[PDB]
Design an enzyme around this catalytic site. Sequence first.
Site, mmCIF file in Angstrom:
data_model
loop_
_atom_site.group_PDB
_atom_site.id
_atom_site.type_symbol
_atom_site.label_atom_id
_atom_site.label_comp_id
_atom_site.label_asym_id
_atom_site.label_seq_id
_atom_site.Cartn_x
_atom_site.Cartn_y
_atom_site.Cartn_z
ATOM 1 N N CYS B 146 36.117 43.852 37.321
ATOM 2 C CA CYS B 146 37.011 44.755 38.040
ATOM 3 C C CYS B 146 36.335 45.983 38.551
ATOM 4 C CB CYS B 146 38.146 45.192 37.131
ATOM 5 N N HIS B 192 47.141 34.414 34.349
ATOM 6 C CA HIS B 192 47.665 33.837 35.563
ATOM 7 C C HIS B 192 48.860 34.612 36.108
ATOM 8 C CE1 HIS B 192 44.835 30.739 34.489
ATOM 9 N NE2 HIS B 192 45.246 29.907 35.425
#
Lengths: 363, 363
Positions: B146, B192
Site C-alpha cells: 500500500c 475480498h
Amino acid sequence: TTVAVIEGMATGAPQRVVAQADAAARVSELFVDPQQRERISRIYDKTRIDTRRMAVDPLDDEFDEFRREPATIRDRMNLFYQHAVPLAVDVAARALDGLPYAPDEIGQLVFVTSTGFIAPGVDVEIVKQLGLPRSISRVVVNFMGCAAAMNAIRTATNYVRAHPSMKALVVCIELSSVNAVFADDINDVVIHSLFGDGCGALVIGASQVQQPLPAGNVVIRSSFSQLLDDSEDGIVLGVNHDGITCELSENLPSYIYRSVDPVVAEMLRDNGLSKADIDLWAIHPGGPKIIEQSARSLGIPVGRAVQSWDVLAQFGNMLSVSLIFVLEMMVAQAESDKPISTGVAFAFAPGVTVEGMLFDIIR
Amino acid sequence: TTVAVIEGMATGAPQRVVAQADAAARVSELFVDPQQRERISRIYDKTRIDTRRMAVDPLDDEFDEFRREPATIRDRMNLFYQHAVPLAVDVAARALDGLPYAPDEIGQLVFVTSTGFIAPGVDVEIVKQLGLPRSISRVVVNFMGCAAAMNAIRTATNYVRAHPSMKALVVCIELSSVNAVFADDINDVVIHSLFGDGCGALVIGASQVQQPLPAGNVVIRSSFSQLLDDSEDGIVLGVNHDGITCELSENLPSYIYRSVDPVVAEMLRDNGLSKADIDLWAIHPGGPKIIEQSARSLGIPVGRAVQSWDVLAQFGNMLSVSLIFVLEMMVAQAESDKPISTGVAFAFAPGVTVEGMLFDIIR
Ligand SMILES: CCCCCCCCCCCCCC(=O)O
Ligand SMILES: CCCCCCCCCCCCCC(=O)O
C-alpha cells in the site's frame, strides 16, 4: 559537481556445488528415447558450464516428488526466503565489512531478484540482522531479469548523488534452484541446464570529482538503457503454479547480435571514447550464445571477455548476480600497468532491453 | 541547492463500478449458515465502502468457474497485463498531457504494483505507446504494498535531483480483481471485501529552491520510513497457485496505533514543525481500522482525513494507488486562503514499515 563510486563489494552462493556432468546424467535418465536422451546430452554439453551452486538439491528423492507436484508456487517462494536470508545477510555484511562507516551512513537498500516473491522479504532481514537504520529507504526491484543489477546500480547512483553524505547498499540474490521443475517442453530442458544460484552485494558512495579515490574503487562513469523494437518475445518471465519461469526466444541471439554494437557505440559516442579505450568487457554470462553474439556484434574476439566465460563455467547464469561476480574478478585481476583499467558491462532484460554501464576500475 | 516537485498528476480505474451491497449479497449467497451468512453481512457493512472499480466482473458465471479452479496463477498474471496496459497507458498520458516537456525530458519511469508479475510488463508498453525515449531508465517496484507510492516518489526524487534537467514519471497500478478467489479462510473473506482496482500517475521534476513555482505544484518536502519491530506478521504478501494474496494480522490496527505518532512526531521534529502546522492528513485509506487507528494514534479527530474516507467510500483500497487519489482530491479542493496548504501522507507496508512524506501544496 559529483560522481558515484563502488566502495565495497562481495559475492556468495549456496555451498552445494553441482557438476554439470551429474545434472546432465540425472536429467538424461528421465527421457529414455533414442532421439530424446541424445538431444539432452548434446544440450548440456553445449552449455560451457562445469558447475553451478544450488541451494536445493536435485539429488534428493524427497525433493524429486515435490518438484513433480502442481500448485506448489507458494512453498517455493517460502523456500526462496528460507535459503535467501542467511546468504543475503552474509554477503551484505561482507560488502560492508572492512569499511569505515557507521550504519547511520547507510541510507538506501536496493534489493533485487527475479526468482522469489514474498513480503515482508529478505530486504527487511538485511536491515534487522545487519542493524541498519530503520529509517532506511528501500526499493525492491523484481522481474527486471539478468540486467537488474544495472537498474539497481543506476538507482543507487541517483541516491548518493542526491544525498552525498549517505551510502547505498545494493544486494542481488537469485535462487533458480528453488524454481526447478520437470520438463513440460524443450525450453524447460534448456532453462534448467543454465540457471544457478548466487548473490552479490555492493556499497555505493558519492565523491567530489577529482578527489584522490581509494584503489579498488570502481567509478560509475555512466549507465545506459535501450528498449528494443520487435523483440518482446526475447526474454519472458512468468509465474506458474509450480514455479517462476524464464522463456527464451530462439531469436534472442540474433536480437542481441543486431542490437549490441549500435547501443554500445552510441554510448561510447556520447562518452567520447572508442572500443580502443575499453580495456574490459563485462558481458553478462547468460550462456554461450549470449557472450558469443555480444562479442561478434561488437568487434571483439569471443574469448576476450574472459571473466564472463570464467563465471559461466563455475556458476552458470545467476541472472542479476553474475555481473557482480564478473566485476569482483576484474577488481581482483589487476591486468594492466595503467592507473585506471576501464570497462563496459551490459546485460539483457525482458523487452528486449540492453542495460549497461561504463566504468573505470581505480587499479 | 535544489528540491523535488510534482508537475503533473492523474488517476484512473476500471469502468465497471461494483456496489458493495451487491458484492455483499453475491458473497452472502455462497455461505448458507445462520451464523455464517450473518457474519458475512456484518463484515461488508463495516467496510465503509460504497463502490469499487473492478476490471474483472464478479457477475459473469464464466469468470465464476475460473475463480474456482486451482493453478491459474499464470493466467491471472496475463490477465493483469491484458487489463493494465490500456489503463496505465491512458493514465500516464493524462499525467503528461497539459505539460510543456518533450519526451526527451522524461528520463525515468518507476513502475509500481503488488498485484501482477510479468515481464516484459506494463512499463515497456508505457514507453512504447507513449513514445518515451528508449534510453529511459526503468525501475519496477513490486510487493512494497500500500505504501509503494512513497518508495516510488522517493526514488523519483533522487533521480530528478541527481539529473535536474530531466523528469521522472511514476505510475502505480493495482488490479486486485484479477487475484480474486473463493474463500479458503476468514482473512480471504475480509480481503475480498476491501481491495479494488485503480491506477495513478505522477510527473516529477526538479526546482531551484526559492523559484516562483506554478500553482498546483506539490512540493516533496521530505520523505520518511520506519521499519518496526515485532510486527512481521502485520501485512503479508504472497503468491499462491490461484492468485496473489495479502494476509493481515488482527493486531495490525494496534501495530499502527503504537507506531504512527512517534514516527510522524519524529519526522516533524526533524523538519521543525508540529501537528498544528499540518493542514492535511493523507492517511492511506486501507480500511476503516487503518484510518481510525492512524488518527487516534496521532492527536486527530477520526473524520479529519476526509479525502481518505472519501476514497475508501468510492474506490476501496487500491493499495499504492489510493494515496495518489487522496492527493489529487486535495489539489482539487483548495480548502484555505493560505498560499501553501501543507500536509502529511503515510501508509503501511509489510514489515511493518511506515512510509510517508511531508508536502506543501502550492496554492
Ligand atoms: C528467472 C526465473 C528462473 C527460473 C528457473 C527455473 C529453472 C531452475 C533451474 C535450476 C537447476 C535445476 C537443474 C536440474 O534439474 O538438475
Ligand atoms: C495485494 C494482493 C491483493 C489480493 C487481492 C485478492 C482479492 C481481491 C478482491 C477483489 C474483489 C472480489 C469481489 C468479491 O468477491 O467481493
